[PDB]
Amino acid sequence: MIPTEEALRIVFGVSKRLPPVIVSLYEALGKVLAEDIRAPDPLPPYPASVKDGYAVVASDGPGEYPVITESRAGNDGLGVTVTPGTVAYVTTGGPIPDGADAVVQVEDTKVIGDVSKRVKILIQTKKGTDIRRVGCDIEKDATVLTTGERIGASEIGLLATAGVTMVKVYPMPIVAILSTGDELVEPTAGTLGRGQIRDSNRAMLVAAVMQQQCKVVDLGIVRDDRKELEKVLDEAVSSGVDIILTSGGVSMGDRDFVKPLLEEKGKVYFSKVLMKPGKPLTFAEIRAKPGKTVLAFGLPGNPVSCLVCFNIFVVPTIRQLAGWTSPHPLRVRLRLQEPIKSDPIRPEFHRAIIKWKDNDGSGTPGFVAESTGHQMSSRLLSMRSANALLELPATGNVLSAGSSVSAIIVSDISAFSID
Amino acid sequence: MIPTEEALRIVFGVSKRLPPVIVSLYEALGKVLAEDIRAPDPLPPYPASVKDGYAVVASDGPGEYPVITESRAGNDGLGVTVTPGTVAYVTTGGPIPDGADAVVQVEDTKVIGDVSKRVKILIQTKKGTDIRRVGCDIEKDATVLTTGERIGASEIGLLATAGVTMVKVYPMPIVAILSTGDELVEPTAGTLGRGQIRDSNRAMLVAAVMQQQCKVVDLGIVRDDRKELEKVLDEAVSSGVDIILTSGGVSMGDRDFVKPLLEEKGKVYFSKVLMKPGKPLTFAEIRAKPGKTVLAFGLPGNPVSCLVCFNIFVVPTIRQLAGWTSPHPLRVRLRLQEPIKSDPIRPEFHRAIIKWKDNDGSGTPGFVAESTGHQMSSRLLSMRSANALLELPATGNVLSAGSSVSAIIVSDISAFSID
Numbered sequence: 001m002i003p004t005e006e007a008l009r010i011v012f013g014v015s016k017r018l019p020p021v022i023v024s025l026y027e028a029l030g031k032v033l034a035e036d037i038r039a040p041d042p043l044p045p046y047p048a049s050v051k052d053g054y055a056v057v058a059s060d061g062p063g064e065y066p067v068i069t070e071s072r073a074g075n076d077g078l079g080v081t082v083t084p085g086t087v088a089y090v091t092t093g094g095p096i097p098d099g100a101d102a103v104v105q106v107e108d109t110k111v112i113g114d115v116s117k118r119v120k121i122l123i124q125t126k127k128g129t130d131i132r133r134v135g136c137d138i139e140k141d142a143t144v145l146t147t148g149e150r151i152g153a154s155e156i157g158l159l160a161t162a163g164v165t166m167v168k169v170y171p172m173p174i175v176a177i178l179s180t181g182d183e184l185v186e187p188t189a190g191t192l193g194r195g196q197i198r199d200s201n202r203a204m205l206v207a208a209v210m211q212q213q214c215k216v217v218d219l220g221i222v223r224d225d226r227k228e229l230e231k232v233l234d235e236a237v238s239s240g241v242d243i244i245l246t247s248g249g250v251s252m253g254d255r256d257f258v259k260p261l262l263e264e265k266g267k268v269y270f271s272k273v274l275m276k277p278g279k280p281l282t283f284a285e286i287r288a289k290p291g292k293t294v295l296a297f298g299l300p301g302n303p304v305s306c307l308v309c310f311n312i313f314v315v316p317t318i319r320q321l322a323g324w325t326s327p328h329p330l331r332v333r334l335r336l337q338e339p340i341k342s343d344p345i346r347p348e349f350h351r352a353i354i355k356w357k358d359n360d361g362s363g364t365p366g367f368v369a370e371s372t373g374h375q376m377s378s379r380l381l382s383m384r385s386a387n388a389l390l391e392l393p394a395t396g397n398v399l400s401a402g403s404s405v406s407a408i409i410v411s412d413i414s415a416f417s418i419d
Numbered sequence: 420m421i422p423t424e425e426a427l428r429i430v431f432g433v434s435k436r437l438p439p440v441i442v443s444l445y446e447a448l449g450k451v452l453a454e455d456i457r458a459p460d461p462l463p464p465y466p467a468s469v470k471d472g473y474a475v476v477a478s479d480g481p482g483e484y485p486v487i488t489e490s491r492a493g494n495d496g497l498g499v500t501v502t503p504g505t506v507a508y509v510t511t512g513g514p515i516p517d518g519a520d521a522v523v524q525v526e527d528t529k530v531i532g533d534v535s536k537r538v539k540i541l542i543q544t545k546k547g548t549d550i551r552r553v554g555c556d557i558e559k560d561a562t563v564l565t566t567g568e569r570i571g572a573s574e575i576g577l578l579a580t581a582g583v584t585m586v587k588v589y590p591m592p593i594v595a596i597l598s599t600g601d602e603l604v605e606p607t608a609g610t611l612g613r614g615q616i617r618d619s620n621r622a623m624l625v626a627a628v629m630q631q632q633c634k635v636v637d638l639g640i641v642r643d644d645r646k647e648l649e650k651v652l653d654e655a656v657s658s659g660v661d662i663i664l665t666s667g668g669v670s671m672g673d674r675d676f677v678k679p680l681l682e683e684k685g686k687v688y689f690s691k692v693l694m695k696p697g698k699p700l701t702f703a704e705i706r707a708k709p710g711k712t713v714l715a716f717g718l719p720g721n722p723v724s725c726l727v728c729f730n731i732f733v734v735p736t737i738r739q740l741a742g743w744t745s746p747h748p749l750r751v752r753l754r755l756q757e758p759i760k761s762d763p764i765r766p767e768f769h770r771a772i773i774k775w776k777d778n779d780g781s782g783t784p785g786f787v788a789e790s791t792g793h794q795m796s797s798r799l800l801s802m803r804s805a806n807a808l809l810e811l812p813a814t815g816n817v818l819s820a821g822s823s824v825s826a827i828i829v830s831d832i833s834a835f836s837i838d
């Protein structure tokens with residue numbers, strides 16, 4: 001039985017970034033860049049107006065002037081030179097005609113006469129005012145995005161700015177998922193027969209893997225039969241998946257074949273972890289016959305233990321395979337809203353609902369946590385709405401309301417409900 | 420020009436939750452429940468063993484006993500009564516045979532003899548030990564999920580537990596997106612002609628809407644021509660989309676037709692907001708001809724202003740339409756890692772890279788922020804890697820390193836890179 005910190009280091013040490021691939025612009029969203037991106041031309045590529053108004057010769061100053069051209073886009077004002085004593089109309093983003101050295105926003109001007117166009121400039125401007133010089137936002141050949149950078153909406157915007165529609169990225173791993181048990185029935189079952197339960201771990205894990213943006217290979221329910229589970233595992237290993245997730249069949253039962261099958265097919269690094277919940281977790285590395293490595297997680301059958309182990313061990317493995325340089329989950333410090341008793345032997349991953357408060361109880365703003373209630377590993381209602389796992393050390397003491405603890409954030413911090 | 424707080428209240432007051440729909444189990448992931456979910460049967464539906472070991476009569480105590488049945492699943496041990504002086508083998512999740520009232524884990528037992536099976540129970544157990552009574556995890560008819568609850572992986576697990584494979588939920592809005600400008604070219608363009616730039620806002624907004632899990636209707640580049648933009652807007656309004664996003668054509672240019680077109684087609688609630696960046700934001704409500712409401716956001720053309728306005732105003736509108744009871748973004752308090760000058764007139768949404776530190780500079784743990792650098796609204800590099808918007812009040816003063824500010828979190832808090 002190894003500590004969770006060691007089990008994580010073993011998984012990190014075995015897990016390898018996947019080979020990069022080439023994808024289209026919208027397929028690159030959410031993925032990590034596997035190349036640097038350089039601007040092929042400057043932004044703006046021409047001197048551009050910051051305002052709707054008039055391009056002027058700054059030294060002219062306030063006065064009345066004829067409007068010799070209008071410049072909004074493309075070839076507008078091409079070949080026209082704004083000389084001292086003239087002005088040109090411009091819209092925001094319009095090219096500055098040759099000879100103009102500043103822009104006076106339309107609010108500081110007045111159109112004069114009926115009908116030839118004339119405008120009154122109401123202020124003294126300064127050279128360079130309200131003009132974006134060539135390359136002031138992005139210089140030609142500047143690196144706008146680098147290898148190891150995760151692509152979000154602004155990074156998609158920068159790729160589009162630089163004219164990149166095919167991107168080299170690290171792909172997401174493909175994950176096979178199966179459930180084990182003679183007691184299981186499909187979640188479509190109505191009236192349950194004696195000694196049956198609906199398979200809940202498979203759909204829970206499919207959903208968890210969908211939230212990590214990975215393709216899922218759903219291998220269904222497997223019975224407690226060694227030859228049957230070996231056949232499904234051999235089929236999962238040779239299919240091309242990168243990760244295999246099983247649940248159940250990893251305790252002390254006489255028909256728990258997951259561990260001995262992973263020992264035959266590959267190398268089991270560990271089968272027991274000092275943690276509450278999640279003790280019987282198995283981690284193995286299998287080589288598929290030519291050829292590639294396949295990571296196998298023998299997750300515990302208990303629904304809570306299953307999802308806690310997914311959140312702590314499988315999420316960083318997916319991220320590592322997908323080329324994330326920082327795969328660890330966000331850990332914050334927070335105050336307890338109620339007392340919680342820690343375990344005397346195993347450090348606990350106590351499920352909680354956390355929120356940011358203007359006053360965390362200590363007079364300063366901070367995160368606070370409420371327990372989800374009874375933490376029994378068979379009680380999936382303890383995972384309901386839990387956005388964090390409180391890391392309670394193995395002291396056996398009652399942590400009173402107001403005490404501070406470390407918490408792992410397991411669900412979108414930007415989707416956190418406010419206080 | 421209205422404050423951002425008022426502009427948000429107007430948007431919230433106009434935005435209505437979409438009618439609920441019925442979807443399959445995996446389609447419900449990420450969506451808000453539009454009905455309560457009750458367990459049709461208990462969990463466990465039979466008294467179940469917590470351990471691999473033996474089901475016993477607690478009062479018998481330590482001793483040697485014959486193993487009269489084996490119970491792992493289904494009908495195993497049906498009709499067999501464990502009487503005083505006998506035991507039954509059980510696996511975790513196996514039904515407890517009639518007459519047995521406790522379970523002794525296999526580690527507290529020893530198999531005796533060769534070959535009839537006999538086992539030695541090494542301890543004195545207590546009635547009810549290591550047995551999950553019927554309904555101890557979930558009672559029959561208990562509400563396991565309620566209306567207004569967002570569905571994550573554990574909620575998918577609870578739906579599967581309760582045998583629900585078709586779910587009533589609030590759908591996501593469908594969003595139409597177009598760009599405006601005679602200066603724009605597609606992001607596939609190579610060498611740019613004079614006065615041209617690649618359309619970056621459209622792909623940026625498509626990506627931003629994809630991260631919000633909404634269907635996108637890509638309406639392309641529209642030129643600065645009133646009749647052309649009216650035709651595309653009329654086509655967007657009658658297509659069935661719930662939200663229309665335009666960018667550009669909302670400043671003071673003589674060919675900026677977005678505002679007057681939204682005034683003709685519907686009701687414009689505002690066209691100017693007191694903020695840095697994002698001043699020319701237009702918000703309108705259009706009624707499609709029978710019939711339904713369509714929300715239109717005339718986003719600013721400047722790439723930074725475009726994305727900042729999306730993050731502040733469009734994200735909560737999407738969430739409100741999708742039935743989120745808490746659509747507001749997460750706001751935290753944090754310390755500045757460097758000095759920042761605030762604007763004397765407009766409150767600024769200064770882009771930053773934030774992280775949780777064990778020491779935020781004050782001796783206690785907390786979030787800290789680094790600026791992304793020059794904040795010019797034309798500089799999309801200021802959005803690069805920004806996971807927060809610092810809310811800087813309009814004081815004109817230099818906020819020194821170490822001072823505390825409010826920050827809006829704009830990207831997955833569970834995807835935050837650690838310190």
Ligand SMILES: Nc1ncnc2c1ncn2[C@@H]1O[C@H](COP(=O)(O)O)[C@@H](O)[C@H]1O
Pocket residue numbers: 179180181183184197198199200201202247248249250251253256300301302303467468510511512513
């Ligand atoms: N797919 C599943 N869905 C729900 N419960 C499960 C699943 N697989 C295993 N379990 C339960 O988890 C516990 C441990 O499983 P095992 O390790 O196979 O003994 C038992 O109570 C099982 O009935």
Ligand SMILES: Nc1ncnc2c1ncn2[C@@H]1O[C@H](COP(=O)(O)O)[C@@H](O)[C@H]1O
Pocket residue numbers: 048049091092093094598599600602603616617618619620621666667668669670672675719720721722
């Ligand atoms: N789709 C777009 N992509 C990049 N820049 C844009 C886009 N639309 C408008 N702009 C720029 O944003 C600024 C304001 O646009 P407008 O409001 O149309 O004058 C100008 O500098 C435009 O060239």
Ligand SMILES: [Mg+2]
Pocket residue numbers: 180181182248249301512
């Ligand atoms: Mg089992």
Ligand SMILES: [Mg+2]
Pocket residue numbers: 093599600601667668720
């Ligand atoms: Mg324009």
